[PDB]
Design a protein around this ligand. Structure first.
Ligand SMILES: [Co+2]
Length: 257
């Protein structure tokens, strides 16, 4: 099936998912000088006080921290968004080395990792219906650089031993995603896609300008995960990122001057 190897990686996905060569694929390079300030955007409203995390799952490509999305408990609104988007899961993309790992780039700079908080538009009733719409999802992307530890990440890092291999899950209740956000909500936004198969063109991307810092030790624990299932040959879960795709006929907007 698809993955991140030489024989099944990003360069191959178009064979099964022709939308890989589409008009609004993600990620992209964010050219900071060409993005334009848009005074009519909103502040973002991130309302995560009532979040209910449930579980963490190694799905063979990343790990997902899953939320109860059966009520408006953790929602994203405002900014470029019309209406209410419910948090379903977050995950990360990361590298084998601190010099790569992010999906989006900023003036061609790659960060060590990128956090994706995935939300679906409540007008479409469920995630599966939302991904079939051009405004179905809103993904909040946050860059990670290596430096100081991120305290609010530690509970995630320390459960990773229990979900080493594909298909393993663990209970993951009472996790507060607010502890993964930077101070500033300044952002760039553009219309794009999921960055993994099926690559659906359903995402309003909201990429924060300010990275969070995580420690070397924290990212090293990401890199101990496995893509494989238990009892299969070990293949470290690293470099689970798609490179930048052509911008095509899109403009990236900034919420800040
Ligand atoms: Co992602």
């Amino acid at each position: 099936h698809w993955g991140y190897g030489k024989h099944n990686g990003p360069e191959h996905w178009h064979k099964d998912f022709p939308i890989a060569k589409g008009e609004r694929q993600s990620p992209v390079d964010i050219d900071t000088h060409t993005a334009k300030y848009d005074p009519s955007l909103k502040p973002l409203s991130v309302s995560y006080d009532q979040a209910t995390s449930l579980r963490i799952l190694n799905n063979g490509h990343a790990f997902n921290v899953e939320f109860d999305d059966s009520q408006d408990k953790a929602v994203l609104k405002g900014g470029p968004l019309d209406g209410t988007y419910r948090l379903i899961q977050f995950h990360f993309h990361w590298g084998s080395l601190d010099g790569q790992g992010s999906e989006h780039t900023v003036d061609k700079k790659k960060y060590a990792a990128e956090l994706h908080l995935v939300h679906w538009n409540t007008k479409y009733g469920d995630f599966g219906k939302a991904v079939q719409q051009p405004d179905g999802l809103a993904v909040l992307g946050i860059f990670l650089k290596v430096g100081s530890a991120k305290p609010g990440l530690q509970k995630v890092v320390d459960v990773l031993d229990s979900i080493k291999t594909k298909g393993k899950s663990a209970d993951f209740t009472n996790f507060d995603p607010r502890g993964l956000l930077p101070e500033s909500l300044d952002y760039w936004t553009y219309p794009g896609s999921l960055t993994t198969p099926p690559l659906l063109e359903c995402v309003t991307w909201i990429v924060l300008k300010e990275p969070i810092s995580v420690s070397s030790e924290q990212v090293l624990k990401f890199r101990k995960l496995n893509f494989n299932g238990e009892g299969e040959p070990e293949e470290l879960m690293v470099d689970n990122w798609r490179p930048a795709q052509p911008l095509k006929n899109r403009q990236i907007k900034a919420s800040f001057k």
